[PDB]
Amino acid sequence: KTVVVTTILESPYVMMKKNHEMLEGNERYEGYCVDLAAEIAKHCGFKYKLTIVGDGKYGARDADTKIWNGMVGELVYGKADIAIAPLTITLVREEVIDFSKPFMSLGISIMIKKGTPIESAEDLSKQTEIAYGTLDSGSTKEFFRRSKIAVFDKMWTYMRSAEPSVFVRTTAEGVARVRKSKGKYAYLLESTMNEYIEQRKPCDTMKVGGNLDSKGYGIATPKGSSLGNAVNLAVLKLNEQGLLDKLKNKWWYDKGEC
Amino acid sequence: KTVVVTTILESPYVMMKKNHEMLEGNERYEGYCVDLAAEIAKHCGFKYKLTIVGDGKYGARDADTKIWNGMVGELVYGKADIAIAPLTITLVREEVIDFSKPFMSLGISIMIKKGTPIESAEDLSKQTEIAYGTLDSGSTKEFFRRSKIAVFDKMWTYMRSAEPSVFVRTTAEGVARVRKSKGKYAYLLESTMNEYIEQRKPCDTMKVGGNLDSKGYGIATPKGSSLGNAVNLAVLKLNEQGLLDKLKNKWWYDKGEC
Ligand SMILES: Cn1nnc(-c2onc(O)c2C[C@H](N)C(=O)O)n1
Ligand SMILES: Cn1nnc(-c2onc(O)c2C[C@H](N)C(=O)O)n1
Ligand SMILES: [Zn+2]
Ligand SMILES: [Zn+2]
Ligand SMILES: [Zn+2]
């Protein structure tokens, strides 16, 4: 009866409270999605338990085994009843799970160490001195892997064959790589995350250029789940009442340090 | 079998071609949604007929009779099979009809005659010299009617009682009113349209301030329609293929004249 929620440890969506070792259950975490989960549950009328995705991934289907990993996998195989996280709504994913209307709009963007001579994706594609990559098992990698657009296809051709690997296991790893690369590495990640990091110490990174695409994050449930309808309506209601905008301001700027 | 498509004459979504008089059927029209309709039809494998919504409205429910008008009404009462137009995804609408994932992201915005002493919604709410209104039977009017935000609530209190009426029957009427009111009227409309008009002659209007909210347009179908699933997946594929962005560029900036 208690709804198992799968989510991912990604700041500021879900983070461990400093004194979590002395706290229990859902009280161990804080963040945008923790606040959202509480609201969704209250509006749909269900008790829930937050769980961090086992493999720490968002979700991709293995080309060879055809098995889904990440949060998507936990829903597909019945390990979780719902996913409340910054999970990108994509075709390949909507084919196996359901998504509520988006609770946040975003797009792929470029993150650079301040001072880096890069202003756009075209710039990256036309040079070689500055390496660039994306998250592994994510929607961004898939975006480049399938793009028919000249600039993006060129970028994918480079990234897929670059050595050492330009891909990272977690968003945090990508951000750290940018910060330690002395301007020789640019990271491709979603806009709102890029924006968030730009407001965090050491305030040494920034978003450059416009977004490469437009899409959104949605609350996911297993195909045919009975929670689907109510969750979707809850998201729409919460968006219209301004809760989502308040939560972004709370976790992004109200706590900004730059 | 031929799918009856309901849409609305709104530039640059659906417009009569310069030579429409010598054309028949779907050939009489051109625009973003005309192009989108053809793509959706091709991917879902259906033949269709474009029809212009009878009462020229988007869709609102009569508070007394509870009867829906506009494109929403044509779907609810079975007069149309699908709505392919810049129809805003809202809670009250999703309760009676189905919406595909967003094909365009936008937000409420402020349009002014160039030179008008207004920079934000707050500025409008604090003065009386400049009147401002919204479209009738639309999602924006509902936004202000339900807003509990100090500024927005204050604005609604004024608009609902303003004399003469600050509300308009069509988007065009609102734009024309701003242009001929010598800066004494400001119009609240959705960002994408505001931006479009700003790049059209006589280049005498401009969008000011940020969007008041964030939401999107979706393709709508009657509840339980057999087209729902395919249309939804089609929208996702088109966005990822870059088609939606291509269309935006084709009808917005490739035709700008300022
Ligand atoms: C929360 N967040 N910030 N960036 C990202 C991000 O950047 N590239 C990706 O593939 C992702 C993951 C993405 N949200 C997904 O659902 O796969 N997620
Ligand atoms: C295409 N377009 N530009 N502005 C609008 C607009 O501005 N205020 C409204 O209520 C609307 C209509 C809205 N899309 C709706 O679906 O009701 N629609
Ligand atoms: Zn710890
Ligand atoms: Zn609430
Ligand atoms: Zn196509």
Residue of B237, B208, B227 whose CA lies nearest to B98: B227
Contact A245, A6 (CB under 8 A): no
Say yes or no: CB of residue A189 within 6 Å of ligand 1.
yes
Cis peptide leading into B117, omega within 30 of 0? Answer: no
Nearest by CB to residue A237, choosing from B91, B215, B233, is: B91
Q: How far is the CA of B64 from the centre of ligand 5 (A)?
A: 43
Contacts (Cβ under 8 Å, ≥6 apart) of A88: A58, A138, A139, A190, A215, A216, A217
Determine the 3-state secondary structure of B55 from DSSP.
coil
* CA angle centred on B158, ends B157 and B161, rounded to 5°: 90
**What is the count of residue pairs from A and B with beta carbons less than 8 Å apart?**
70
Mind listing the domains of chain A with CATH numbers?
1-106+216-255 (3.40.190.10), 107-215 (3.40.190.10)
> Which residues sit opposite B112 in a β-bridge?
B206
Own/partner contacts of B95-98, CB < 8 Å, gap of 24 or more, are B95/A233, B96/B68, B96/B72, B96/B223, B97/B72, B97/B220, B97/B221, B97/B222, B97/B223, B98/B220, B98/B221, B98/B222, B98/B223, B98/B224, B98/B225, B98/B228
What are the beta bridge partners of residue B110? B188, B208
Q: Give the rounded distance of the alpha carbon of B208 from its chain centre.
A: 19
C-alpha to C-alpha distance for B145 and B143, rounded to whole angstroms: 5
Structure tokens at A187: 């990271």
Centroid of chain to Cα A248: 14
- The CA distance from A90 to the nearest CA of chain B, in Å, is 7
Q: How many CB atoms lie within 10 A of CB B119?
A: 12
CA–CA separation, B169 and B166 (whole Å): 10
B140 Cβ contact partners less than 8 Å away, ≥ 6 residues apart: B108, B134, B188, B189, B190
Distance B114 CA to ligand 2 centre (A): 22
> What's the A21 CA to ligand 5 centre distance in angstroms?
52
Q: Are strands B3-7 and B48-52 parallel, antiparallel or unpaired?
A: parallel
Per DSSP, B126 falls in state T
Number of C-beta neighbours around residue A228 at 10 A? 19
Q: Tell which one of B61, B84, B140 to mutate to probe ligand 2, the residue whose CB is within 8 A of the most ligand atoms.
A: B140
DSSP string for residues in chain A: -PEEEEE--BTTTBEE-TTGGGS-GGGGEESHHHHHHHHHHHHHT--EEEEE-TT-----B-TTT--B-HHHHHHHTTS-SEE-SSPBP-HHHHTTEEEPSPSEEE-EEEEEETT-S--SHHHHHT-SSSEEE-BTTSHHHHHHHH--SHHHHHHHHHHHH-SS---BSSHHHHHHHHHHTTTSEEEEEEHHHHHHHHTSTT--EEEES--S--EEE--EEETT-SSHHHHHHHHHHHHHTTHHHHHHHHHHTTT---
Cα angle for residues A23, A28, A30 (degrees, 5° grid): 140
Q: Round to whole Å and give the CA distance between A80 and A71.
A: 8
CA distance A179 to A165: 17
Identify which of B12, B6, B60 has the alpha carbon closest to the alpha carbon of residue B171. Answer: B12
For residue B3, which of B227, B237, B232, B235 has the smallest C-alpha distance?
Answer: B227
Q: Is B107 in contact with B215 (CB distance < 8 Å)? A: yes
Q: Hunting for tokens 């964030």 — which residue is that? A: B214
Asked whether B10 lines ligand 2 (CB < 6 A), one says: yes
Which residue in A215, A236, A245 has the most chain B C-beta atoms within 10 A of its own C-beta, making it the best mutation to test that interface?
A236
Q: Give the ligand 2 atom nearest the CA of B90.
A: 16
Cα(B137) to centroid of ligand 2, in Å?
Answer: 9
Which residues of A lie inside 8 Å of B (Cβ-Cβ)? 89-91, 94-95, 99, 101-102, 105, 143, 146-149, 213-216, 218, 232-233, 236-237, 239-242, 244-245
Asked if A192 contacts A104 with a C-beta cutoff of 8 angstroms, the reply is yes
Question: What does the alpha-carbon distance between residue A189 and residue A138 come to, in Å, rounded to a whole number?
Answer: 10
Nearest to A97 by CA among A65, A58, A124: A58
The tokens describing B126, both together, are 């604090």
Give CA–CA dist A251/B90, Å, rounded: 25
3-class secondary-structure state, position B206: strand
Token pair recorded at residue B137: 């039977």
Residue type, A29: Y
Q: Decide if A95 and B143 are in contact by the 8 Å CB cutoff.
A: no
Report resolution in angstroms: 1.9
Per DSSP, the three-state class of B16 is: strand
DSSP SS3 for B243 = helix
Q: In testing the pocket of ligand 2, which one of B189, B207, B213 has its CB within 8 Å of the most ligand atoms? A: B189
Whether residue A195 has its Cβ less than 6 Å from ligand 1: no
C-alpha B127/C-alpha B111 separation (Å) is 16
B interface with A, Cβ–Cβ < 8 A, is 89-91, 94-95, 99, 101-102, 105, 143, 146, 148-149, 213-216, 218, 232-233, 236-237, 239-242, 244-245
- Atom 5 in ligand 2: residue holding the nearest Cα: B190
Ligand 1: centre distance to CA A253 (Å): 20
The two structure tokens encoding residue A122: 């075209």
B131-143: b or e for each residue (b if 16 or more CB lie within 10 Å)?
Answer: bbbbbbbbbbbbb
Q: Which residues of A178-217 are buried (b: 16+ CB within 10 A; e: fewer)?
A: bbebeeebbbbbbbbbbbbbbebeeeebbbbeebbbbbbb
**Quick one: which of A166, A96, A86, A175 has its CA closest to A134?**
A166
How far from chain centre, in Å, is Cα A186? 18
Q: Is the dihedral of CA B162, B91, B58, B55 positive or negative?
A: negative
How far apart are the CA of A200 and the nearest CA of chain B, in angstroms?
A: 24
Q: Do A236 and B102 touch (CB under 8 A)?
A: no
Q: Measured in Å, how far apart are chain A's first and last C-alpha atoms?
A: 44
What is the distance between the alpha carbons of residues B228 and B221, in angstroms, rounded to a whole number?
Answer: 6
Whole-angstrom distance, CA of residue B123 vs CA of residue B151: 9
Q: Bridge-partner residues for A133, per DSSP?
A: A187
Residue of A nearest to B241 (CA): A147
| Dist. CA B120–CA B132, nearest whole Å | 12
The Cα–Cα gap between B233 and B239 comes to 10
Q: Is A8 left (phi over 0), alpha (psi -120 to 50) or beta?
A: beta
- Report whether B87 contacts B214 (CB < 8 A): no
In chain B, the N- to C-terminal Cα span, in Å, equals 44
Binding-site members of A for L-glutamate are 86, 88, 93, 139-140, 190
Bridge-partner residues for A48, per DSSP?
A3
Helices (H) and strands (E) in chain B — how many of each? 10, 13
Shortest alpha-carbon distance between residue A228 and chain B (Å)? 13
Q: List helix spans (H) across chain B.
A: 32-44, 70-76, 91-94, 121-125, 139-146, 150-161, 171-180, 191-198, 228-240, 243-251
In ligand 1, which atom is closest to the CA atom of A87? 16
Tokens of B238: 């088109």
The vertex-A90 CA angle with A89 and A91, nearest 5°, equals 135
